[PDB]
Amino acid sequence: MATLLQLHFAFNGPFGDAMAEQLKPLAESINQEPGFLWKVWTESEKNHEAGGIYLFTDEKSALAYLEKHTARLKNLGVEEVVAKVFDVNEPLSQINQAKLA
Amino acid sequence: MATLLQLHFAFNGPFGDAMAEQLKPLAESINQEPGFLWKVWTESEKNHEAGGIYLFTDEKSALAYLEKHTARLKNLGVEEVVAKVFDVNEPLSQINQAKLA
């Protein structure tokens, strides 16, 4: 469905490599979630947060699947994954057309 | 600096039009934050959240400016706007090249 979803959590959930390397070949196994369209290529020790915004197979699975990721980090990691699915509010795209033009 | 920042708060902070319409001409006055590159074109009543991810003049001003937005909504709105600046973790961009290719 090419849904754009927010998916991020605090760093020090895993040590970090779980994202930087171990996300690539183990994502479907470790987090147990596919993604379908693309994956999260975000990590920020300086921000103490790891994750970003990426495309998920759909919105409905997306909010349920935060708990998929979260089931790991709630246990050994940190707090919870912040995942929501927003919608495009087109009126304000007027003020978008500077850098994204 | 074309910094990509997360900026979103819960809906029912403003009635909503503060984003949908009133953000466009009043953004610099209401929130009193410029943005520079582009603005946030997100609104989601179904998610009960309003805001998204957009480019800010820089990261340093970005985390300080959450409180700019927040000084309004902490007073009359909802909780606090969620704003963080993440970084690009390029090794996982391998798994990005499906839909963003």
Question: Domain of B18: which CATH number?
Answer: 3.30.70.100
Q: Chain A residues with CB inside 8 Å of B86's CB?
A: 8, 42, 44, 47, 49, 51-52
Q: What are the φ/ψ torsions at residue B71 (nearest 5 degrees)?
A: -55, -20
DSSP summary character for residue B44: B
- For the stretch B68-93, what's the b/e string if a residue is b when 16 or more beta carbons lie within 10 angstroms of its beta carbon? bbbebbeeebbebbbbbbbbebeebe
Mark yes or no for CB contact B89/A43 under 8 Å. yes
Residues comprising chain A, all counted: 101
Which residue in B33, B38, B49, B56 has the most chain A C-beta atoms within 10 A of its own C-beta, making it the best mutation to test that interface?
B38
Q: Provide the residue range defining the domain that includes B58.
A: 1-101
Shortest Cα distance from A87 to chain B (angstroms)? 6
| Residues in CB range of A61: below 8 A, 6 or more apart | none
Whole-angstrom distance, CA of residue B84 vs CA of residue B18: 22
Distance of residue B28 Cα from the nearest chain A Cα, in angstroms: 12
Q: What is d(CA B74, CA B78) in angstroms, rounded to the nearest whole number?
A: 6
Identity of the residue numbered B65? Y
Smallest CA-to-CA distance from A35 within A10, A54, A51, A63 is with A54
Q: Do A6 and B53 touch (CB under 8 A)?
A: yes
Which pairs with CB-CB distance under 8 Å and at least 24 residues apart come from B64-72?
B65/B33, B66/B7, B68/B31, B68/B32, B68/B33, B69/B7, B69/B9, B69/B31, B69/B33, B70/B9, B72/B30, B72/B31
- Encoded tokens for A75: 């246990």
* Residue A15 Cα, gap to closest chain B Cα (Å): 15
- Distance, in Å, from the CA atom of B20 to the CA atom of B16, rounded to the nearest integer, reads 7
What's the DSSP call for residue B31?
Answer: T
Q: What is the dihedral of CA B94, A21, A41, A82, to 10 degrees?
A: 140
Residue A79 exposed, middle or buried by CB count within 10 Å (0-12, 13-18, 19+): exposed
Q: DSSP for chain A?
A: --EEEEEEEESSSS-SHHHHTTHHHHHHHHT----BS----B-BTTTTEEEEEEEES-HHHHHHTHHHHHHHHHHHSSS--B--B--B-GGGGGGTTTT--
Give the residue carrying structure tokens 């991810």: B53
Tell which of B95, B97, B99 to mutate to test the A interface (max A CBs under 10 Å): B95
Four-point Cα dihedral A3, B91, B94, B39, nearest 10: 30
In which element (H, E) is residue B50 found? Answer: strand B49-56
| CA of A76 vs chain B CAs: smallest distance (Å) | 23
- Distance from C-alpha of B55 to C-alpha of B63, rounded to nearest angstrom: 13
Distance CA B24, CA B8 (A): 16
* Cα Rg, chain A, nearest whole Å: 14
Domain count, chain B: 1
Residue B52's alpha-carbon distances to A4, A13, A83, A101, in angstroms, are 10, 24, 12, 18
Burial of A75 (0-12, 13-18, 19+ CB in 10 A): exposed
Contacts of B93 (CB under 8 A, 6+ apart): A41
Sequence length of chain B is: 101
Experimental method: NMR
Which residues of B sit within 8 Å Cβ distance of A?
A: 2, 6, 8, 19-21, 23-24, 27, 35, 37-44, 46-47, 49, 51-53, 55, 82, 84-100
Distances (CA, A) of B25 to A65, B14, B31, B49: 38, 16, 11, 21
What whole-number distance in Å separates Cα of residue A62 and Cα of residue A5? 7
